[PDB]
């Protein structure tokens, strides 16, 4: 039995940060009381087409009923160069530009 997607709004609490593994971490809060629900998170090449690239690493991206105002960290493996972190789906999704150095 799986959970439906989260339908409420996410916000970034701090600026995304690069890790030793070359991945990026993103700390978000969630305004909804529609939990338990599944956190949508992906990397995109551009903001208009939202073509998926890279991969989400966090294995349990789920908001629970007890989550409330606590903060969640998501970890993604972005492509080399420019891409966008996209948290959530639909009208209220949030994006942040990311650049991964190297080749």
């Amino acid at each position: 039995v799986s959970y439906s997607l989260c339908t409420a709004a996410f916000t970034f609490t701090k600026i995304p940060a690069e890790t030793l593994h070359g991945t990026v971490t993103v700390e978000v809060q969630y305004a909804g009381t529609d939990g338990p629900c599944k956190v949508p998170a992906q990397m995109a090449v551009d903001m208009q087409t939202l073509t998926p690239v890279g991969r989400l690493i966090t294995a349990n991206p789920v908001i629970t009923e007890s989550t409330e105002n606590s903060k969640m960290m998501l970890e993604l493996d972005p492509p080399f160069g420019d891409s966008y972190i996209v948290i959530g789906v639909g009208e209220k999704k949030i994006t942040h530009h990311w650049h991964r150095s190297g080749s």
Partner: antibody
Framework: EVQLVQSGRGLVRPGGSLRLSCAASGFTFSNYAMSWVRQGPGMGLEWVSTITADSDSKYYVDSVKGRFTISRDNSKDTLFLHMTSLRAEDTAVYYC???????????????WGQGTLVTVSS | DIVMTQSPSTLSASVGDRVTITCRAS??????LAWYQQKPGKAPKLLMYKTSTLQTGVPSRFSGSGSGTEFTLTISSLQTDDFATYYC?????????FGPGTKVEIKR
């Protein structure tokens, strides 16, 4: 142009069942969440149910949980609502509605069907 | 649940008049509020979303404002095509609750 053609008028006795259908054309049906919205004397204009583009997520207003089931067939571009245990207060015009942006959860509706009158009376 | 109300339920106005109608939420929905217009016997049409962004093809006499718990839809100069019922709808989160509607009638 976007077209949402819903099934014909339905009359049900209390406790009965009914399935509504909505045939879509004029847009990429498999990329949009789809919703059912009803308008009747018992509840006014009221959202009923939403199903994501890939049928992975389904949502229901509390008064229909356990009685109504939403589904879709993307190979025929068709949306379904399976209504069971219908009560008199469910009497309404039922609308097919398309999400404005693709890959969403039914937040906003930019195209609607013509509507299906559903009367529930003994 | 968040309760959506609207005021007034009905008002009469004349062509050229400035018309404002109100939508309220029992608790804050931030900016995620949309407006629809509906004629008798037809389905609603999306007018406006994110409080103040006009849907494509909607004439510029429509405008919205407000934040949190109080929202308004304004028609700067009413035209005959604008006599209809108007609904607000929240989308901070599901359920996607519509307001009860405001009917704009002709004044004489």
């Amino acid at each position: 142009e976007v077209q949402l053609v819903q099934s014909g008028r339905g009359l049900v006795r209390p406790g009965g069942s009914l399935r509504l259908s909505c045939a879509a054309s004029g847009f990429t049906f498999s990329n949009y969440a789809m919703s059912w919205v009803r308008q009747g004397p018992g509840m006014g204009l009221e959202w009923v149910s939403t199903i994501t583009a890939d049928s992975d997520s389904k949502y229901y207003v509390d008064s229909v949980k356990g009685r109504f089931t939403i589904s879709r067939d993307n190979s025929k571009d068709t949306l379904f609502l399976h209504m069971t245990s219908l009560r008199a207060e469910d009497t309404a015009v039922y609308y097919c509605a398309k999400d404005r942006l693709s890959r969403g959860v039914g937040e906003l509706y930019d195209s609607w069907g013509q509507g299906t009158l559903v009367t529930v009376s003994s | 649940d968040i309760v959506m109300t609207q005021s007034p339920s009905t008002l009469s106005a004349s062509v050229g008049d400035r018309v404002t109608i109100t939508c309220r939420a029992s608790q804050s929905i931030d900016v995620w509020l949309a407006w629809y217009q509906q004629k008798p016997g037809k389905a609603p049409k999306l007018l406006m979303y994110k409080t103040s962004t006009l849907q494509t093809g909607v004439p510029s006499r429509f405008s919205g404002s407000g934040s949190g718990t109080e929202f308004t839809l304004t028609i700067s100069s009413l035209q005959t095509d604008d006599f209809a019922t108007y609904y607000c709808q929240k989308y901070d989160s599901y359920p996607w609750t519509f307001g009860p509607g405001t009917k704009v009638e002709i004044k004489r």
